[PDB]
Ligand binder design. Sequence first.
Ligand SMILES: O=C(Nc1ccc2ccccc2c1)C(=O)N[C@@H]1O[C@H](CO)[C@@H](O)[C@H](O)[C@H]1O
Length: 813
Amino acid sequence: QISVRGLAGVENVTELKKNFNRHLHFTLVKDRNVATPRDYYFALAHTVRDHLVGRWIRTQQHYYEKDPKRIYYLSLEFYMGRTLQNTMVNLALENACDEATYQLGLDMEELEEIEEDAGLGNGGLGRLAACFLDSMATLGLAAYGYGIRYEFGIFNQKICGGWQMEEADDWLRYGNPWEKARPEFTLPVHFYGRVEHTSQGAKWVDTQVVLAMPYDTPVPGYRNNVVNTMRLWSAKAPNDFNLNVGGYIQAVLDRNLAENISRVLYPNDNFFEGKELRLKQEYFVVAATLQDIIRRFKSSTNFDAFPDKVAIQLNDTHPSLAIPELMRVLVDLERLDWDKAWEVTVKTCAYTNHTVLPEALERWPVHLLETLLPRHLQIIYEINQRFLNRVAAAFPGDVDRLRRMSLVEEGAVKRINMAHLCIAGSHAVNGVARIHSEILKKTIFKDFYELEPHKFQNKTNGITPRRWLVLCNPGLAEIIAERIGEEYISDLDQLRKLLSYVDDEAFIRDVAKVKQENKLKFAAYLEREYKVHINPNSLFDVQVKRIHEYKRQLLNCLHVITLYNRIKKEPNKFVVPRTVMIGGKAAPGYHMAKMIIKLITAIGDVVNHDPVVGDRLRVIFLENYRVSLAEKVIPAADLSEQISTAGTEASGTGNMKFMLNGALTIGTMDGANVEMAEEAGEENFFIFGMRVEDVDRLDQRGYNAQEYYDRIPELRQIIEQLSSGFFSPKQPDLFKDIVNMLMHHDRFKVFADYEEYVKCQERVSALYKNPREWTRMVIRNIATSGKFSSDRTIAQYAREIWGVEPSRQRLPA
Ligand SMILES: O=C(Nc1ccc2ccccc2c1)C(=O)N[C@@H]1O[C@H](CO)[C@@H](O)[C@H](O)[C@H]1O
């Protein structure tokens, strides 16, 4: 059908069709008379998987021969989404499979909707890991993703009476055709026990053993025949575990205790909960991974070359135990001296920070580490002592620097600061956008920066143009390719060439056409799967991301209510119609975030059924926001809401997805928004609100929300409506907590940005009245979105952190 989806050769189509029938018969044990769409999905999945195998075995054998430096990306989260379409795209099989399935009398797009998302992540940090694996394969790096195979990923969100209900994400129920169990590579992990000191070193003894079983998932590069590996550990009890009939039975049933380690992903987005189970997960992935790393290195005695052959990237502090675990192995097991072991560790490890919010930082109580990991605590104390000696020597007599920089936090409960541990034990520390990285140097890690300025770097985040353009928006990818060819898909800087098409009337028409088709298709999806009705001619105003106070979904709510009140005041006046879509999950125990969801639905209940409003304003809450839903709503959007309080969103990546797919951005000068506006030109961006400096000034003075309430009549009206029960007639005080929070304890200064936000929103509406000028500004965004490709991000990591050269050269097919 379309060019970028590859060739549908006579011979390829014939082969696909016969392997499809072979798998349906031999693999699924079905015949065409009983087969359901799910059976058809699986036969296709298995048929496409067959094409990976040859390339996967030869990629891995190639690494064994050439022995390049290996990159180990350690993460507790990999937010993968669906795999079928992505595999077809990267293998150039999409059109062939489309043809082959059509000839079998099947609709491939219908089959693609049957795949479960691999939802092994919460949000941004998890999806970054997924984009990174794609880019590393595409750039020909010898890279491995290492994490946990959660039986249950992020929960499915259902909305019931406006409230969020959580249900288990049983994603493995029908099986996962993409993974390959490797039980033969199972490894032991130790917990608890005690430390014994001998003539020749410390020994960790009397431990409980949990087995770690790896599952390998292929990661194909873009049309380069490279297939890398994502290895995910699963927890298994040993067979002498807990080993009378009641006693015998119970001992077998208690195997569950060990296997609970890999059962479920913690659903917290930017908040730290000090739970033992979570600590076990963190050690589990670290201990199993490091043994695999060492095994692979030994199959290349001399650990001097270890950092020449190994890089370990820590995705936040979650796998921070890699540092003392590497020390433990090198000192206790390999018998290296401390200082040499430490040199190796530092040169091997690097740390990426993803947030500045204090409540998100990992601070493990000492008594937890004492019981679960007694040897690691000793190594940590030893690391701390040697580190503080260096601080003392560099800043003599600065006793307060010593307590500020300590890995050990004293107080009610003693805690270990894992961020401090990572900085001390890594040769490189980076933030995820230029503004975020500067904030790390000037505020939270200022002391560490003064000690070791050379450690601190920036690596602005990116998103893969494969999943986030070609896969989810084939229409846009095609019209771009018509003008500038296909090479941009792996070299996104080439989109700049679209600047010379900004006054091209054909191109303007095509861009606007692709968007309207995306909007029609999404409007249909809402009717079919959710029986909700929207005007596809209205402006699609969307904010999708995790529900958090810092992200200020509440500021969006205030604008929405303002528009509604303005309409009710002047019903027969013209306003640009909007569909306001807000989606995202709240962490199960975050009361305020759950209250915000209820507020959103409550506004919709009033707004969507007011006859005077008509189809001029619609408020929709997008249920169960996840990777596969993002792939649908992002191409359909006109306006991207990126309205976090300046200084709080480290980078953001949703912002980039929208820019690449033809939405204009309303946002604050926060995270990557700053660099996006810089690339496109500020005139092509809807920037409003306090900058970081303005937030600082307001804090020095003290934030008084009352002041804004007193001086803004429109804001007063909204608050009074909330208090009085306008949006909750049967529970008049339902939103008292929200009002109280806004008036008295607002950490994120919602009121302070309200006026500029509403003002700027009027400028958006004005521009949308002029279709040709809207579209020309759109073209200016798409054309400057090149910097935000994860290929760029990964090449910077490779060159400035890992010390390896990316390559676009094909491996033989
Ligand atoms: O901190 C994040 N997530 C988590 C996830 C689990 C956690 C568990 C315990 C404590 C903090 C946690 C933070 C996160 O997603 N941060 C986001 O990372 C993105 C990728 O770098 C950024 O774009 C985004 O700005 C940032 O908020």
